[PDB]
Amino acid sequence: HHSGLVKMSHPSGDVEACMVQVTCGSMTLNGLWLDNTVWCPRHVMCPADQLSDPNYDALLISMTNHSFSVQKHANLRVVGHAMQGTLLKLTVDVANPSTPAYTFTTVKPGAAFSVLACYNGRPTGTFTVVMRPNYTIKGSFLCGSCGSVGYTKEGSVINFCYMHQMELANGTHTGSAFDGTMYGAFMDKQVHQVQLTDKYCSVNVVAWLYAAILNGCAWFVKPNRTSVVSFNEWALANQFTEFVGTQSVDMLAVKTGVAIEQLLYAIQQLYTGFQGKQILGSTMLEDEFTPEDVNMQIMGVVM
Amino acid sequence: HHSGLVKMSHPSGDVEACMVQVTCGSMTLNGLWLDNTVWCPRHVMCPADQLSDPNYDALLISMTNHSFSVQKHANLRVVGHAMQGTLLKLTVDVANPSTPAYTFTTVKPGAAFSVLACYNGRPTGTFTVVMRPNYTIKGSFLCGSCGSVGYTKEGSVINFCYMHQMELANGTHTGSAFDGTMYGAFMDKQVHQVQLTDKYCSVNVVAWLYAAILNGCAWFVKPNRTSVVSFNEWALANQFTEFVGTQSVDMLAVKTGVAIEQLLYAIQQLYTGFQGKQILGSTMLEDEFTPEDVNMQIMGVVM
Numbered sequence: 201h202h203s204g205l206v207k208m209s210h211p212s213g214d215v216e217a218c219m220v221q222v223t224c225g226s227m228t229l230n231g232l233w234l235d236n237t238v239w240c241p242r243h244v245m246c247p248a249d250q251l252s253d254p255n256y257d258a259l260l261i262s263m264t265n266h267s268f269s270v271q272k273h274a275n276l277r278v279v280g281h282a283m284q285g286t287l288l289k290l291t292v293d294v295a296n297p298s299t300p301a302y303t304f305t306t307v308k309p310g311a312a313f314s315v316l317a318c319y320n321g322r323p324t325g326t327f328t329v330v331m332r333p334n335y336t337i338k339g340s341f342l343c344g345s346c347g348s349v350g351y352t353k354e355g356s357v358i359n360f361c362y363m364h365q366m367e368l369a370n371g372t373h374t375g376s377a378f379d380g381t382m383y384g385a386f387m388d389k390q391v392h393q394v395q396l397t398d399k400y401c402s403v404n405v406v407a408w409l410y411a412a413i414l415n416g417c418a419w420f421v422k423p424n425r426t427s428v429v430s431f432n433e434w435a436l437a438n439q440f441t442e443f444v445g446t447q448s449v450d451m452l453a454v455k456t457g458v459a460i461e462q463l464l465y466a467i468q469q470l471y472t473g474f475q476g477k478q479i480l481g482s483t484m485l486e487d488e489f490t491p492e493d494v495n496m497q498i499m500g501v502v503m
Numbered sequence: 504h505h506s507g508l509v510k511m512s513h514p515s516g517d518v519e520a521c522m523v524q525v526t527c528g529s530m531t532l533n534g535l536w537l538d539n540t541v542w543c544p545r546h547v548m549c550p551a552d553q554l555s556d557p558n559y560d561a562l563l564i565s566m567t568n569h570s571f572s573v574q575k576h577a578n579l580r581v582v583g584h585a586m587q588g589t590l591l592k593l594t595v596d597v598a599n600p601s602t603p604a605y606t607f608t609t610v611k612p613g614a615a616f617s618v619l620a621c622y623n624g625r626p627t628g629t630f631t632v633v634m635r636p637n638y639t640i641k642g643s644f645l646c647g648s649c650g651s652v653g654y655t656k657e658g659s660v661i662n663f664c665y666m667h668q669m670e671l672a673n674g675t676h677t678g679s680a681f682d683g684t685m686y687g688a689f690m691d692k693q694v695h696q697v698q699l700t701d702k703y704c705s706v707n708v709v710a711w712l713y714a715a716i717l718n719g720c721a722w723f724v725k726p727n728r729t730s731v732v733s734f735n736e737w738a739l740a741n742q743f744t745e746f747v748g749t750q751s752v753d754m755l756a757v758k759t760g761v762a763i764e765q766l767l768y769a770i771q772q773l774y775t776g777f778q779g780k781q782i783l784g785s786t787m788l789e790d791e792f793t794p795e796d797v798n799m800q801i802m803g804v805v806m
């Protein structure tokens with residue numbers, strides 16, 4: 201049996217119209233064009249002979265307006281350049297006539313968002329990730345993908361949340377929000393950086409366990425219950441996030457008649473072992489599906 | 504460690520511009536607008552009091568040109584209507600000025616393609632599936648999603664391959680190619696239909712095992728080998744597809760220096776059990792990644 205759950209990305213058309221190629225002469229990557237502004241990673245200024253110990257303050261001052269070349273696949277003339285954290289804020293003489301209604305917002309661990317992977321300013325693929333507890337993502341990026349963006353949708357509004365920056369030693373990825381900061385303690389310098397331990401997203405595992413009940417799978421549901429407090433205390437010594445309920449999870453407890461605490465108890469049992477059984481055709485806990493994904497794809501309820 | 508493999512969909516912008524709402528007065532679903540043609544499922548003609556034993560020949564003849572209402576979110580006037588298998592071929596007075604360069608092609612088991620799930624003609628999400636051996640897909644569709652399309656991309660050309668039709672008893676899905684036929688032995692009637700047994704896609708499991716080597720995981724690679732012939736004979740009594748090599752798999756054997764047959768041997772071993780070990784963080788064989796996905800996402804090689 202199939203759960204009816206796939207990794208669902210938002211449609212990318214609105215964002216595709218906002219991608220440009222930006223280059224300083226050394227590195228080439230992608231930028232986000234909205235109104236008279238183009239956002240892109242700041243290591244576009246870096247020479248390849250300094251990606252490990254660059255001084256962006258000094259590189260920026262060495263830049264003038266015509267040090268930046270912005271192209272769409274037209275040519276946009278840069279009339280103003282500024283640095284905000286790990287991003288550049290270039291100003292162009294032409295506003296993107298296809299600019300969507302948009303906002304900038306930070307994504308939190310567990311939540312999902314859609315990524316548009318681009319190269320040379322040309323969109324090449326879209327996928328969806330969940331922000332990991334250690335503020336990385338398990339994406340699919342190669343060289344020249346920096347500036348590829350990540351976004352959630354609320355109605356006709358694009359909430360931009362992620363501009364790709366770099367890959368870590370373990371194959372995962374991370375980038376900056378559009379306020380300038382990197383997620384987690386990372387720095388956009390090509391050196392060894394300590395990575396924090398990842399954790400199972402407790403809320404997303406509950407959403408998954410609910411998704412299994414909505415498909416007729418509920419062998420794990422025992423009448424026993426574990427309080428959120430007792431679960432969170434347990435979660436800290438077991439590499440689980442701490443659980444925080446929502447209306448989206450509450451709606452999933454109403455439809456199934458299964459209490460959140462019954463499933464918290466279930467997660468404690470399953471963590472020690474599935475006892476050879478399968479859940480949605482899996483023998484390990486899944487935490488890459490949000491309550492919203494389950495509500496949307498299975499119950500048809502967007503909120 | 505992370506494999507750098509995600510379920511990568513093509514960007515959907517070109518297809519979004521080709522989606523319309525079509526209705527006959529009873530059911531509402533989605534249609535594909537290309538040039539002066541709009542394709543949509545034929546059960547849009549069905550009254551809800553006959554989805555189980557409809558006569559489409561009789562329903563079609565009961566239809567005239569103004570029985571069909573096509574909308575984009577303009578209004579397209581229908582000037583010609585015809586039925587091809589399980590699809591309708593409506594002709595409208597206006598050609599889609601955003602028509603991409605496109606072809607119609609049938610997808611084969613194991614291969615992947617990108618789906619644009621739409622509702623009321625409004626694109627709502629995109630994902631990617633692999634055509635299962637039993638000619639179903641493990642998608643995410645609800646009511647009103649019929650007409651949602653599935654497509655592969657070769658350069659700047661959209662190869663359309665799937666128009667969604669229905670869901671089966673087990674939660675999986677299937678639809679028609681744009682020649683009119685349904686994939687597999689299915690019929691677009693809302694009755695019980697025998698479903699064939701699914702199988703592991705041998706080629707996609709090899710691609711996955713290669714993907715694991717490209718990430719430093721190769722505990723399963725033993726010098727032992729199994730010939731394709733011996734593997735295919737084994738596959739028929741074990742619910743595996745029969746393996747057929749390609750330049751894309753050959754390229755993956757060249758990069759890793761691991762022979763295809765070594766991995767065929769490995770699949771026979773792993774099928775009996777992983778012995779408690781993990782492959783790319785999994786304890787079951789993965790067959791939802793194609794050799795092309797691995798070549799593209801990990802080696803950066805599109806072909």
Ligand SMILES: *[C@@H](O)[C@H](C[C@@H]1CC=NC1=O)NC(=O)[C@H](CC(C)C)NC(=O)OC[C@H]1C[C@@H]1CC1CCCCC1
Pocket residue numbers: 229243246251252341342343344345346347365366367368369373387388389390391392393
């Ligand atoms: C975009 O230009 C690119 C994206 C990378 C390249 C391949 N996959 C990706 O996700 N970003 C970078 O190259 C940045 C540039 C710096 C100025 C920030 N750096 C990297 O991502 O470099 C690759 C990182 C992983 C290797 C360094 C490694 C880390 C552990 C310690 C040993 C060295």
Ligand SMILES: *[C@@H](O)[C@H](C[C@@H]1CC=NC1=O)NC(=O)[C@H](CC(C)C)NC(=O)OC[C@H]1C[C@@H]1CC1CCCCC1
Pocket residue numbers: 532546549554555644645646647648649650668669670671672676690691692693694695696
């Ligand atoms: C699009 O209109 C819709 C898509 C379905 C609805 C929910 N998820 C989907 O993928 N398609 C249909 O409703 C078609 C219409 C017929 C005229 C072909 N039929 C269905 O998909 O009906 C749902 C199927 C599964 C239930 C019937 C079930 C099958 C096993 C035997 C008992 C009855």
